Design a protein around this ligand. Structure first.
Ligand SMILES: NCCC[C@H](N)CC(=O)N[C@@H]1[C@H](O)[C@@H](OC(N)=O)[C@@H](CO)O[C@H]1NC1=N[C@@H]2C(=O)NC[C@@H](O)[C@H]2N1
Lengths: 44, 91, 78, 103, 60
RNA sequence: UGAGAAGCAUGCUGGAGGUAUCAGAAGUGCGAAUGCUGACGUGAGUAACGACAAAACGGGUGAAAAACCCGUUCGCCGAAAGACCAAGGGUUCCAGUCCAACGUUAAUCGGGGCUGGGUGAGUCGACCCCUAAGGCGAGGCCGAAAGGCGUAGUCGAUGGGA
RNA sequence: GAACCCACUGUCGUUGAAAAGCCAGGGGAUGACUUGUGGAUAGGGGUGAAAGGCUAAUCAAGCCUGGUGAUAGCUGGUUCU
RNA sequence: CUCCGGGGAGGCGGCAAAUAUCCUUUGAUCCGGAGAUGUCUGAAUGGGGGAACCCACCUACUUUAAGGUAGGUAUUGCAACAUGAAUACAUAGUGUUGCAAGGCGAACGAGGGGAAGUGAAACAUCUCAGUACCCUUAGGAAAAGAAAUCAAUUGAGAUUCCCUCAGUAGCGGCGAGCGAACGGGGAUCAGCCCAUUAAGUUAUGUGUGUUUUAGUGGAACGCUCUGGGAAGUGCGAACGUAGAGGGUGAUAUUCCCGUACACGAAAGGGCACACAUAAUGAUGACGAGUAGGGCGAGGCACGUGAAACCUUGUCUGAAUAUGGGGGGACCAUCCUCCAAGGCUAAAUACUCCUGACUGACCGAUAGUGAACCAGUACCGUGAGGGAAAGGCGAAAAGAACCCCU
């Protein structure tokens, strides 16, 4: 049966990407939190 | 195109059965080149530093392998190869 | 770009509605703002300002030229 | 104090206490002495280089604080101090104050 | 070598840099082919290239 | 040995710390909370080994062959169980070598470990020129702030252009 | 009436081959049709040929992090002589 | 990589041994200071974009082919200049140059908005609480501050913080709860101006003093017994302005590194005080749409109450030193102060970070989630969640060689 995850890299980058996060204040706060926690990879 | 870039364009020759057959049969040289080098750069570099006349250049890029030593992973760097065709019998 | 009076600086403030059973809910009080065109002789033109009726009372008492000079000195494009 | 690659030392602690020789190398806090502190090494032969293996005897390092410089005149263990003779620093024996013999 | 390197003019230094880069390329080719047993030649060529560029920046 | 929580002496193991007396302070005593973490039992050498398209023999190699290789027969698919492309994956592709772990059995075999190779374009595709839905948006209008919408523009293929 | 899209009956399966299937039958099959790529609508909100249906195996108010060690006149447990 | 200073025999960073080529007393490795170089993304700023990519233009030099070097090309605000509509003067608009800003980061400060779980043994006033959270924006601190203030013997004398007064006076479905001030004792102490204009502060240079970024010297122990090994037993000795600590084959003041103490800086940095130049303070010259009032709210311990006082959304509205504000409804008398203009150190709050030192704090299920290649493996579309895993030996001396397979 069809499952929930149907991967598409263009959609992945446009929804969860670095520039998408930079575009809004809440996304910049997300990036700040992840930098403070010390994640090795900030975004997808 | 300057001399400083000229001395960095080429890296070394390729030693393999395919390269050996190509050289022994069609007079084609195989070189490892800089990843950012272009065909015109390669042509001018070969012509200046080997005194032979180049007919055409073909290039290809091979991605590096990802493999493990012990408990850590690693990746090798990409390698760009150049197939340089010379005229008649040269080099 | 806001409900702010150019002449006096008034703006909405917050408060409470109070019912007969003393229930309190948040509200705001708004200024009596609106647009008005004033003839300015020194520059031969109409200047349009967003201001309150208290702003008009101040303009009536002091003159339009003095008020415009004060706003320009405060750094507004009038 | 100081102990360098050429001096004559005497072992003051360990299984080799009382013996003497010439130091071979100094590195960190370990020193090697000629003919002293020998070990038996079971060496496997090296396929690439041949050199069929066997049992060999070689020096092993001691702690640098287990050896003392030797005073030739009195043949006894001694400490090392520094003195500015003329305009240059030099090593001297604490007991007598004379200059330390060179290698 | 920087001592005697500093005792040369700008034009001499630039030429020296030119044959030094040429020599570095030649040594790289020789080592890649396997005709060079000693790599300190490559190391010192690199080092003097850096030295000449430093001295040129200082002198200009 | 003492009424008890417990104390004392000593054989073996172990290989560097322990601590009287009298005071002082507590992370001070566990069998249970369908308590928490790790290790190991019973069921039990029990059920099962994943489409009922199907296998048989000779030779080879090997420590070992029902499963690998070569050969001779038998059977199954054939609008897909064959041949391609996009998306997605990323070396799984080829050769040599190894069999501990992985493969629902063994394995000399492998999409497994190790070493070394391999992707060649003016014409194929992308990049590039053009725009749809839609997004962003100099000035601008609006909003306590953060911001909302939008003009000129600028992007955006699933479409047009050797 | 094939492909394709559905899901009416029965057997089996229920520590399954499968966290919704297989097999034998069944319905629509030029239309209010099926489908790829890319977009829009966001939680007392959305969307709904309307079942309180669906909104990432979660829905009479999604998920995550904070207030937060919420409160519990209730149940359990509470270690030497 | 370069220079300056230190230092004096080894060195070529770690996992991580071996090996090779080697460097170094013509002074290496190493330590401190000052310089040179410094790809691409990212506020990212030439345009665009799915971050680490795609596409450009203009100058100067260089090439003869299809390029190379360097510089420049964002927006907004301010200033100068130029140009310039409807529209005649003009203004709007447009461009060039020069200057400045944007982003990030622990806590503390100030300001704009602002809950509910809960308690009241139910619940709506009330509480929780101006707490959590969101937004804007400083500084090394911020804010406040020199009486239109309190007091009530006619006395005190700017602001801030701590101890009392006191769980008192009061507020309150007079419930649950909330909760002062006066006075007294301390910490620190400081005032100066409104157009000829002050104290103070910030930059720049000079001078003096201190501190800091490498380092140098630095005392004194032998014999014997046990033992694999002595620092341990037994016997005697020495230093102490040094008997802190760490290491060495078991427990060391006299073996090593050190310790007390005494010395030390080419060059650079901080702080302190004093001079010179800037600049600021400093659009402001005694305070009118202001004080006061009517209506609705908010703040004061104070919930409309006998409710003074402060702020203002709306409507109004004085006197102006023979004047005006306050003393908790209001009036009279007394006492006290002068609003509608400004600047100002200390005592106070905090720790992303740096150096030294300390613990009746933990010792691998503890202590940070993380002693180990941890915000990793792994889970999730995503925000996010989130582990397990320390110990051979003093020294590899890490088992040559033989046998089964
Ligand atoms: N601290 C909180 C006290 C709560 C009250 N006590 C509850 C109460 O008694 N409400 C009643 C009630 O709602 C109803 O009359 C009746 N009885 O049904 C109305 C009819 O006018 O009158 C209300 N009374 C008031 N309205 C006024 C107001 O809001 N402001 C001023 C003063 O006039 C207030 N008092």
């Amino acid at each position: 049966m069809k499952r929930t995850f149907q991967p598409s890299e263009l959609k992945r980058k446009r929804v969860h990407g670095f520039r998408a996060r930079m575009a809004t204040k809440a996304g910049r706060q997300v990036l700040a939190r992840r930098r403070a926690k010390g994640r090795h990879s900030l975004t997808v | 195109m300057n001399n400083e870039r000229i001395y960095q364009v080429l890296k070394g020759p390729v030693f393999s059965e395919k390269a050996q057959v190509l050289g022994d049969t069609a007079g084609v040289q195989v070189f490892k080149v800089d990843i950012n080098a272009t065909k015109l750069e390669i042509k001018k570099a070969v012509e200046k530093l080997f005194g032979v006349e180049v007919v055409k250049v073909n290039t290809t890029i091979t991605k590096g392998k990802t493999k493990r030593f012990g408990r850590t992973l690693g990746r090798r760097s990409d390698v760009k190869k150049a197939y340089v065709t010379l005229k008649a019998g040269q080099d | 770009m806001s409900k702010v009076c150019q002449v006096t600086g008034k703006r909405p403030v917050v408060g409470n509605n109070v019912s007969h059973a003393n229930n309190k809910t948040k509200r705001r009080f708004e200024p009596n703002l609106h647009h008005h065109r004033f003839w300015l002789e020194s520059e031969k033109r109409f200047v349009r300002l967003r201001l309150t009726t208290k702003g008009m009372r101040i303009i009536d008492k002091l003159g339009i030229e003095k008020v415009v000079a004060d706003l320009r000195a405060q750094g507004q494009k009038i | 104090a100081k102990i360098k690659k050429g001096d004559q030392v005497i072992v003051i602690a360990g299984k080799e206490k009382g013996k003497q020789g010439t130091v071979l190398s100094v590195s960190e806090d370990r020193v090697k002495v000629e003919g002293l502190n020998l070990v038996k090494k079971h060496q496997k032969p090296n396929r690439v280089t041949g050199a069929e293996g066997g049992i060999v005897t070689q020096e092993a390092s001691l702690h640098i604080s287990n050896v003392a410089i030797l005073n030739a005149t009195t043949q006894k263990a001694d400490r090392v101090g520094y003195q500015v003779i003329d305009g240059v620093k030099t090593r001297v024996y604490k007991s007598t104050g004379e200059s330390v013999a060179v290698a | 070598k920087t001592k005697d390197l500093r005792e040369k003019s700008v034009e001499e230094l630039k030429a020296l840099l030119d044959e030094q880069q040429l020599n570095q390329f030649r040594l790289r080719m020789a080592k890649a082919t396997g005709q060079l047993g000693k790599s300190h030649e490559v190391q010192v060529a690199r080092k003097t290239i850096a030295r000449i560029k430093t001295l040129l920046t200082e002198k200009q």
